[PDB]
Design a protein around this ligand. Structure first.
Ligand code: G3A
Ligand code: SAH
Length: 261
């Protein structure tokens, strides 16, 4: 029924070439070449990002969609791209990242970009069962894509359900991935969360067209259904005649070193 649900259905009908072209059509992409080479050779002091996630969070942060301050908690940190980005910001005092890091799930990577010493990584942790703790900035980048819209809806509502427990503790800032903002139950949960905690959902330009993910952030407030549909309209427009044309941009390079007294 929603424009987004139609989008998912049409997405699944695309042929191999069209899907490949479609996913990167008119999107922005950071050049990960140098970063990947450094990481692969064991370099930990060049300030390169451990994943594409660092650039994603930087985009939100640099334009006020989320302030990174004080005690930061990163649910589903994976390799740690968001933890390292937050750790390098002066306003941040500490970072706790939690992730599964098991059975194929990315484990935290160890590099020494600025503030690596203020991050405490913990793997083998299912954040749905992790007891909420008080923090100032809450981050969560969880949401596994599924060809089934019903399934993406279920996974998204589960993430928001868990995240609400943490926001309820009282947080100033947040940036939470919403896998399928186009699903009706999700739209309603977002409207309820907005009334309780404020914020709104924003589409990151670094996201590929093959996913409708948007992020629930604290730095702005807008009409949820309107903006989710604006993104649905954009995604459907790009599916008409995929060019695979991408805009390459410089990846994030952070300063290096420990943050000491
Ligand atoms: N028409 C197509 N749609 C595709 C394809 N691969 C993915 N998708 C769609 O994009 C969505 C995002 O894909 P992404 O690779 O970024 O996320 P996942 O790694 O979690 O993909 P899954 O949703 O987990 O799918 C697993 C695999 O299943 C295959 N798959 C998934 N959907 C399809 C379809 N519709 N047609 C053909 N083959 C399909 C494909 O090889 C996928 O890699 C996915 O949920 C699908 O709705 C594809 O080859 N063709
Ligand atoms: N229930 C759960 N508990 C903890 N971690 C989970 C989880 N479900 C998924 N994850 C992890 O969440 C991560 C999402 S990808 C996160 C990327 C990160 N923002 C970066 O910048 O690198 C994956 O590693 C996935 O394994």
């Amino acid at each position: 029924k929603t424009l987004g649900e139609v989008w998912k259905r049409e997405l699944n009908l695309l042929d191999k070439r069209q899907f490949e072209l479609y996913k990167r059509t008119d999107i922005v992409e950071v050049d990960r070449d140098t970063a990947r080479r450094h990481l692969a050779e064991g370099k930990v002091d060049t300030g390169v990002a451990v994943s594409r996630g660092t650039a994603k969070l930087r985009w939100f942060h640099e334009r006020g969609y989320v302030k990174l301050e004080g005690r930061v908690i990163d649910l589903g940190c994976g390799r740690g791209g968001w933890c390292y980005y937050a750790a390098a910001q002066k306003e941040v005092s500490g970072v706790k990242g939690f992730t599964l890091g098991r059975d194929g799930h990315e484990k935290p990577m160890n590099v020494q970009s600025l503030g690596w010493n203020i991050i405490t990584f913990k793997d083998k942790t299912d954040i749905h069962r992790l007891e909420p703790v008080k923090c100032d900035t809450l981050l969560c980048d969880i949401g596994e894509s599924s060809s089934s819209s019903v399934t993406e809806g279920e996974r998204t509502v589960r993430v928001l359900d868990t995240v609400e427990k943490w926001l309820a503790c009282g947080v100033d800032n947040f940036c939470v991935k919403v896998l399928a903002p186009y699903m009706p139950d999700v739209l309603e949960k977002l409207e309820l969360l907005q009334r309780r905690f404020g914020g709104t959902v924003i589409r990151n330009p670094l996201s590929r067209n093959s996913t409708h993910e948007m992020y629930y952030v604290s730095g702005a407030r807008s009409n949820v259904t309107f903006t989710v549909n604006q993104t649905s309209r954009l995604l459907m427009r790009r599916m008409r005649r995929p060019t695979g044309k991408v805009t390459l941009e410089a990846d994030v390079i952070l300063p290096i070193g420990t943050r000491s007294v």
